Amino acid sequence: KHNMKAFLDELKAENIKKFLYNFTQIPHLAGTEQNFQLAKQIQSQWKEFGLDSVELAHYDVLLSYPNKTHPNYISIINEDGNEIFNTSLFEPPPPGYENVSDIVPPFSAFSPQGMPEGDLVYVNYARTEDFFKLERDMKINCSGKIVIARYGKVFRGNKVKNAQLAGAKGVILYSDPADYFAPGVKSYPDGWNLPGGGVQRGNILNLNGAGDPLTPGYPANEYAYRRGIAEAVGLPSIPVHPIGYYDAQKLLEKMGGSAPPDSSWRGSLKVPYNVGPGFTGNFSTQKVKMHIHSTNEVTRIYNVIGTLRGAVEPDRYVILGGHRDSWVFGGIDPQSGAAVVHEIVRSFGTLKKEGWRPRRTILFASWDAEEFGLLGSTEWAEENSRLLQERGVAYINADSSIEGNYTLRVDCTPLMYSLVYNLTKELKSPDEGFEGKSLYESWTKKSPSPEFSGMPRISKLGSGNDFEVFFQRLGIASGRARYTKNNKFSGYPLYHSVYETYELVEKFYDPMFKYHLTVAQVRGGMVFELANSIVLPFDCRDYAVVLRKYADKIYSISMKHPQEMKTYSVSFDSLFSAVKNFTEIASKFSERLQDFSNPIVLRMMNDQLMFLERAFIDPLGLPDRPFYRHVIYAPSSHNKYAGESFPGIYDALFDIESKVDPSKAWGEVKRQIYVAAFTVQAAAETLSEVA
Amino acid sequence: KHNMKAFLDELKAENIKKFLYNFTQIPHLAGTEQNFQLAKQIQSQWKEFGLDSVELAHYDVLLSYPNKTHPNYISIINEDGNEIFNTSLFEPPPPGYENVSDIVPPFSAFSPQGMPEGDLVYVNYARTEDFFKLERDMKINCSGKIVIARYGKVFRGNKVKNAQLAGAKGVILYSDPADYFAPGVKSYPDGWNLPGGGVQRGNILNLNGAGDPLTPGYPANEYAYRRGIAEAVGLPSIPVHPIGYYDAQKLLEKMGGSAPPDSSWRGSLKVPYNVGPGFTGNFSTQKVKMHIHSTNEVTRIYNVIGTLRGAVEPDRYVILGGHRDSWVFGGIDPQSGAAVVHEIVRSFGTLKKEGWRPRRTILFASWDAEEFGLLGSTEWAEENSRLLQERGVAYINADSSIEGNYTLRVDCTPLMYSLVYNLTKELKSPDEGFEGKSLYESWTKKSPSPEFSGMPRISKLGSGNDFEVFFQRLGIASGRARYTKNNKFSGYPLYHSVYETYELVEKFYDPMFKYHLTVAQVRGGMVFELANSIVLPFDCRDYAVVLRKYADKIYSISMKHPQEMKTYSVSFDSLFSAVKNFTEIASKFSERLQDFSNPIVLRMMNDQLMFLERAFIDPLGLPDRPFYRHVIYAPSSHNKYAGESFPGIYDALFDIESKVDPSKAWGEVKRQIYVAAFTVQAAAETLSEVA
């Protein structure tokens, strides 16, 4: 038989291991020749594997690189202007790679150039609340200071935005052992911890879903009109650079001014974690100087796009997509994901060679430049937006398959919950102590749902990966799944470091490649069901259940201000009414879905299921974020990695007691309630009888 | 048989006559009780006629009415402040209607209140070019003047916008005999001409597709959040009032200052048509004073929505829609259209009673508040946008069926050209001298295509009627057809006057109701084909042909500035490339459409045809006009009634030699070329093989 079991059984841990090794021997930085060569290799193999067509789709997008002959670094400078301490020019390369060329040194992609000199202020994680605590409670002024922040908790682009708005003249990002060194585990290469010389690379843009900073709305094709740099989307206005904890300790140890306000501000280094500004008495005349000479340049990038044409509904697309570009070797990020995609393609191709095709078309993508702002997936979706609009069933992401070895981690639309519960019940758990048990059992035991007793936890989709354009801009049902640790937004210790290698994975994360195999079964299984099930495997009732939970939650936030709700007549009745109607109508649609040989009614009904995620899109977008159009979900305005529910109302209520004109502020809360109630009702009505 | 011939044969001139009489005995002004009663009558009869469901969809929208106890008028005032001449408080009512109550006096809907006093300047038609001629050539300054303009040539809202931007402190609109009095025909009631006391009503908004000024983007439902009046969309900032030519003559006769610049500025009254400012010597101290006390108020409006469920594709919608609200009796506008819709419903219902259903669902609409800004159609489409998005096959408009008795007038998407040529070849001409000939023959003879030798003329869709939201915002293939005169944007003489009655139509326009019947056959026939043809009756090749014509035209406009095109490297090569590709791909799609028993391929192909108009929508909209999203067509920025092709490039090039920063201006031309080439290519690719 050619069924899901046939598909699943053909996947091999040994193949994923071979592919990972193959993808991680040299760096594959976006816009470099080596990453163009890997793209051509993948294109060739996907053809070999049996796909109907495999093309490269290229774009010319803004990237950012250090200057090879003028290196980035930070100094402590004395009053004579002598640089008495300098941060490292590169990470000590790992054993056996000390002669690899073209390892990009640590840098913050898209930093402007500058050489600012000033006094340090330590801002903890540089979160919105950390800056509130500094300015409002401690009365510390960041204007014209160099801010030093530890990595972790939120997307680093939000840190930089926050520092900029606090008036900082530069930002130093560092990895604190508190966040990147697990107690009792050894540093790379003897364990999976971050050494003192390790540094996390990463872009610091605030693109809000725009894609290439120069071409928002349109693909960066060969005739594209580009904004000038001054009008580019999402570039930081102050220099930024990351460092490791050996260098950070040297910068923090001399810090004076005010004590940290509490223990949540102290990391694990042997320093007081004084907030500053500036150094204690003896060193009060010393300053910190940054030297940043990185350049932004328009650079060609290449996506590989593989097609397996559907036998029955070739105009319905199930997409499996993940990126290929890496900061250095990409041992976990992304090649642990890409190796799984490669094996999934191989298995689907094996079935195809025996005469099978999926019912719907499957598209497979190897995205470029994800590390520089989701650029490859976003440009391709801008180019193909009308096709995706009208034909996109689902998008399944495929970055890193592992970030730990503890249990499954799934983020997806409520429309895919039942598909995921059902599939994981049919898969074997790879976990020690659960041999003979289902993945559903071990996942549910290790990651219990807090909201829904007895179920495993499934999180909201945020952003910070390639599903963003498909889900938040276009409204195509999306999901992702990976193995994870027991710090959820911080990354694993070696994240975006030179030390993230094949050996890291083979020695410390997944020696038998059983977690990679489990994740290939989950991702590949989801794609298989989505592409082959006669009725799309979406349960609208799961959306009704979460909508009620999110409505309760947003109402509860507003109800912290009962006087204002009274004064301005702020009612959530419309939103609860719309959610009630969505519940009722979804329940009736489910009955019809059970109760209909008629392919028009079937496809009519499958169209209603497909367009249900689409119904949550508002073509006007969210306030000042035109590329975030989903009304139920958006990346949090304070942390791109986290999803926020009813984001328009949430941002309207955020810090509302601080707004100078409460009448206007509460008016805008009421506007967002109306938009949310309307969109929920309109989405519900897509499920009503069509005539 | 139940075929188109059965449908067509059931339509009766005698029925349309009875319905017109029924719809025109009392005024049906939007937001009044009488128009709510007509809505309920129509709802009842559509049910009686056999539709599956008929509902009222209501909205609470901003309307505008004169103050019943404080009437609008204009004076000439002497230096003592004595009002020595006053304009009329009402039109002399027509014979037999002198005791009808609730005839709204002439007024400009949505004028603000005010009593401005000042000197007159005569601005011809108040077109963009008339103001260029005044300010640039004649050096006349409208700042703080009261402008008097004749009606005609462009939408009156554009006149008012133009006067406002010229700094006028008020606008007087009048009907000149040159534009509203046909030589050798008698005044109402003895002929169809405008009497000296007649006045054209009409709104003066600049909504740019927004709908209700208070709720742009969202339906004005019972929980809607409304903008405050200061932030409302499209309201004029200066008072405006219309008058007839007896009153206009009194205002113009004393005008001094400069002579008219040429004969195109002179109407037919016995006055010099001096441009002013102010009156000649003896009267130099006299001034004009307006008194406007109209109020804007949120008022309930009601659409009637009738459904005839499709037998095979109930989730595909063909819409026949036209308005019901009128300024006074609506003898032509709209009830000549509504009476035709009513008979079309009756005929479709007759077939339904015998067991027939159309293949696709037909929706029938009686829109409210069209006269106040397309409010009823626009709110309903905002409410139902997701359904319309994904299911809307076509919209056929149905305002006035006649505006003359000479020949057919058709405006539609190129996708409907072939449908219209084919249908008109199968219909009998109602024209004297063409008995026994087809409507195609008489139409082609009387209205030859200028662009396409041997074909009849088909015009672009502009706006100023209820198809606007469906076509320019949502991208649903649209069309309209009516009988017309041999002045195309000016209106017929009695347009929006009290004199537009049943008797006007029965006595002077269409005594035998044969033109109404021909138009019922064209509109009803188009709906029938669209709702019943197995393959959607759209020919993508006709789009390819017009796209080339529009590309040539826009390139030719740019080529008036060859030095700048050289200096700024302005190339249209991308747009011509995209049009060439669209031509090639459309030709190949047509072949496949000919060459495929498979309903999935059929519906796959019908979806490609349906979504082809949709592919021209840009979700970012046109510059500062977010509700005009179609990239090929938009209402002209200088005349809402006229369609403009490649509007984004056209507006970028318009008056470009006057821009202060040519580098920036030509940059924006290049941007619009890129947007246009991209959208044309993307539309083409919706017709490629889907996988």
Ligand SMILES: *[C@@H]1O[C@H](CO)[C@@H](O[C@@H]2O[C@H](CO)[C@@H](O[C@@H]3O[C@H](CO)[C@@H](O)[C@H](O[C@H]4O[C@H](CO)[C@@H](O)[C@H](O)[C@@H]4O)[C@@H]3O)[C@H](O)[C@H]2NC(C)=O)[C@H](O)[C@H]1NC(C)=O
């Ligand atoms: C969830 O679904 C239900 C449908 O089951 C839907 O109920 C609808 O609610 C609206 C608004 O509350 C009702 O609107 C009424 O409609 C009648 C005409 O049918 C009007 O006469 C009413 O207006 C009068 O009363 C108003 C309210 O006090 C006054 O402000 C107004 O000026 C009038 O005097 C009113 O408009 C509608 O009838 C129902 N439909 C039903 C019950 O079938 C509900 O709106 C849906 N929720 C959302 C968020 O969409």
Ligand SMILES: *[C@@H]1O[C@H](CO)[C@@H](O[C@@H]2O[C@H](CO)[C@@H](O[C@@H]3O[C@H](CO)[C@@H](O)[C@H](O[C@H]4O[C@H](CO)[C@@H](O)[C@H](O)[C@@H]4O)[C@@H]3O)[C@H](O)[C@H]2NC(C)=O)[C@H](O)[C@H]1NC(C)=O
């Ligand atoms: C209409 O349809 C045709 C397809 O038939 C389509 O042709 C495409 O044109 C583009 C842009 O002109 C071609 O792009 C080239 O692609 C190759 C890789 O395949 C690149 O190597 C080329 O780039 C080099 O040369 C450039 C131009 O001088 C340099 O600027 C650049 O830096 C590189 O050195 C170039 O990108 C594409 O291959 C074709 N596809 C074909 C012929 O099949 C055309 O674009 C369509 N029109 C529109 C408006 O979309």
Ligand SMILES: *[C@@H]1O[C@H](CO)[C@@H](O[C@@H]2O[C@H](CO)[C@@H](O)[C@H](O)[C@H]2NC(C)=O)[C@H](O)[C@H]1NC(C)=O
């Ligand atoms: C990764 O695997 C690929 C695919 O086998 C290897 O590329 C092949 O290399 C051989 C030997 O040089 C060539 O003959 C083939 O043409 C290549 N096939 C391709 C590119 O599809 C590649 O060398 C491996 N890389 C590493 C680092 O092991």
Ligand SMILES: *[C@@H]1O[C@H](CO)[C@@H](O[C@@H]2O[C@H](CO)[C@@H](O)[C@H](O)[C@H]2NC(C)=O)[C@H](O)[C@H]1NC(C)=O
């Ligand atoms: C930090 O790096 C800087 C730059 O290389 C070093 O300063 C340079 O030292 C040389 C030789 O002493 C001088 O000729 C240059 O003028 C210096 N450049 C600048 C910008 O100061 C510095 O010595 C290094 N500091 C440490 C402690 O290693």
Ligand SMILES: *[C@@H]1O[C@H](CO)[C@@H](O[C@@H]2O[C@H](CO)[C@@H](O)[C@H](O)[C@H]2NC(C)=O)[C@H](O)[C@H]1NC(C)=O
């Ligand atoms: C997940 O599995 C459940 C249990 O098998 C599926 O629910 C059943 O679906 C069939 C077919 O429609 C019904 O006859 C049963 O009554 C359902 N049982 C229930 C609801 O308890 C469910 O459809 C699956 N989810 C998917 C496929 O998305």
Ligand SMILES: *[C@@H]1O[C@H](CO)[C@@H](O[C@@H]2O[C@H](CO)[C@@H](O)[C@H](O)[C@H]2NC(C)=O)[C@H](O)[C@H]1NC(C)=O
């Ligand atoms: C227009 O025609 C309608 C439909 O026949 C007339 O309305 C009917 O009036 C009769 C007699 O008063 C009532 O018994 C019916 O209930 C009405 N039917 C409806 C409203 O569907 C209406 O009077 C006619 N109007 C004019 C001005 O002739």
Ligand SMILES: *[C@@H]1O[C@H](CO)[C@@H](O[C@@H]2O[C@H](CO)[C@@H](O)[C@H](O)[C@H]2NC(C)=O)[C@H](O)[C@H]1NC(C)=O
């Ligand atoms: C134009 O209309 C105005 C308003 O009705 C007339 O002016 C009024 O005349 C009466 C009696 O003479 C005065 O008591 C009012 O004070 C006047 N009102 C104003 C605002 O002036 C005027 O007479 C009319 N003019 C003509 C020529 O008919």
Ligand SMILES: *[C@@H]1O[C@H](CO)[C@@H](O[C@@H]2O[C@H](CO)[C@@H](O)[C@H](O)[C@H]2NC(C)=O)[C@H](O)[C@H]1NC(C)=O
């Ligand atoms: C308008 O009528 C023409 C002529 O009958 C239609 O074109 C024919 O369509 C049939 C069916 O596809 C073909 O076999 C003929 O070869 C066509 N003749 C031509 C192109 O000259 C055309 O399809 C009709 N247009 C519609 C229905 O939109």
Ligand SMILES: *[C@@H]1O[C@H](CO)[C@@H](O)[C@H](O)[C@H]1NC(C)=O
């Ligand atoms: C690298 O640095 C030097 C010194 O400023 C500069 O001249 C060279 O052009 C740089 N390379 C760039 C900016 O790409």
Ligand SMILES: *[C@@H]1O[C@H](CO)[C@@H](O)[C@H](O)[C@H]1NC(C)=O
């Ligand atoms: C912080 O310092 C800057 C620059 O000296 C000053 O202009 C600004 O007002 C200060 N902000 C606060 C909140 O005190």
Ligand SMILES: *[C@@H]1O[C@H](CO)[C@@H](O)[C@H](O)[C@H]1NC(C)=O
């Ligand atoms: C793998 O699992 C073991 C057992 O729980 C654990 O001790 C080890 O830390 C894990 N490795 C990683 C990288 O998480």
Ligand SMILES: *[C@@H]1O[C@H](CO)[C@@H](O)[C@H](O)[C@H]1NC(C)=O
């Ligand atoms: C009509 O005019 C009078 C005089 O200003 C005013 O008091 C009354 O309220 C008006 N009606 C309105 C504004 O609706």
Ligand SMILES: *[C@@H]1O[C@H](CO)[C@@H](O)[C@H](O)[C@H]1NC(C)=O
């Ligand atoms: C027209 O008159 C106004 C008001 O007196 C003046 O401010 C303005 O500059 C004038 N415009 C021109 C173009 O002369």
Ligand SMILES: *[C@@H]1O[C@H](CO)[C@@H](O)[C@H](O)[C@H]1NC(C)=O
């Ligand atoms: C009707 O047609 C006749 C014949 O051409 C023409 O003289 C008359 O003006 C027409 N009536 C109207 C209202 O156009």
Ligand SMILES: N[C@@H](CCC(=O)O)C(=O)O
């Ligand atoms: N996944 C990359 C890029 C995320 C983004 O740019 O949104 C990172 O977190 O650094």
Ligand SMILES: N[C@@H](CCC(=O)O)C(=O)O
């Ligand atoms: N058809 C009406 C309204 C047009 C509009 O508001 O766009 C008129 O021309 O006056």
